[PDB]
Amino acid sequence: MTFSSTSNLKELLRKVVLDVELGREQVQLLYKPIYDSIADSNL
Amino acid sequence: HLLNGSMYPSIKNISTVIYYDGWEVTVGKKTYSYKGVTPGKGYLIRPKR
Amino acid sequence: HLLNGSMYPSIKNISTVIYYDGWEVTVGKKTYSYKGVTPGKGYLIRPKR
Amino acid sequence: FKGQPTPSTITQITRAKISDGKSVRVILSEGESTKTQQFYLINGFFGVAMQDGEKGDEVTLQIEQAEYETDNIVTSEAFEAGKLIYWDNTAKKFTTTSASNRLVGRVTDGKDSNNVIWFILLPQQ
Known part of the structure; x- marks a missing residue:
């Protein structure tokens, strides 16, 4: 009674997730030191 | 040092450097x-x- | 000392250096x-x- | 020992036996594949493939010469107890036809209603 017989039945076996870094890099605002900001809704 | 005044x-x-020279053994007729x-x-x- | 900036x-x-010069003697007509x-x-x- | 202070010589003490030999490792060809706990003739070794091999992977074949329950017979033939049982590689099924087939065992329990047989696995002649 090898383990390979029961390898397919994943519901029986313990599940442990390989924890790892996932996601996407945050986007920073770089332009602001160069630019003078003027804000008016009626432009 | 200051090679040619540089x-x-x-x-x-470089926090740590490790020197991994290989490893060998002759077990029976075969060398691993x-x-x-x-x-x-x-x-x-x-x-x- | 410094040499051309180097x-x-x-x-x-080098814990110890010993200068072993030879040794010679003229025993009779033969020099050893x-x-x-x-x-x-x-x-x-x-x-x- | 590398850089050891003196020369030294090593003498090999020979021994022949390396493993009990009840099972062997084989590498699967292009057309070959295995499901676990099923009989396959791979690289000339006939045995119970212990793991799912697919192709390129190395799969263990278990050749202990024990008694095995297999079915998977050519159902047209009657497998009386004691008959020599062969492996038809073209059909991938057991058979008593012999002819050019490989001999693999001898039947202990005959063909029952469900076409299940028990047979003793013969050596890898």
Whole structure:
């Protein structure tokens, strides 16, 4: 009674997730030191 | 040192260097070898991520 | 000392240096010479193992 | 020992037996594949493939010469107890036809209603 017989039945076996870094890099605002900001809704 | 009056500074942020020369054993008629780092070549690694 | 800007530091890990010049004697008409270290040569030794 | 202070010599003490030999490792060809706990003739070794091999992977074949329950017979033939049982590689099924087939065992329990047989696995002649 090898383990390979029961390898397919994943519901029986313990599940442990390989924890790892996932996601996407945050986007920073770089332009602001160069630019003078003027804000008016009626432009 | 100051080769030709050029002060080369020390290299930093290399926290640890490990020297892995290979390993070999002759068990029975067969020789099993775990190849180490080739001379000259080296590997710069980001650790344990 | 400094040479053309190159700073050659002192060599470390040489615990002891011994200058074995030869030894010679003229016994009768035959001269017996224990040849020392040849000038312009030298040997590094791992000691007493 | 590298850089050891003196020369030294090593003398090999020979021994022949390396493993009990009840099972062997084989590498699967292009057309070959295995499901676990099923009989396959791979690289001349006939045995119970212990793991799912697919192709390129190395799969263990278990050749202990024990008694095995297999079915997977050519159902047209009657497998009386004691008959020599062969492996038809073209059909990948057991058979008593012999002819050019490989001999693999001898039947202990005959063909039952469900076409299940028990047979003793013969050596890898």
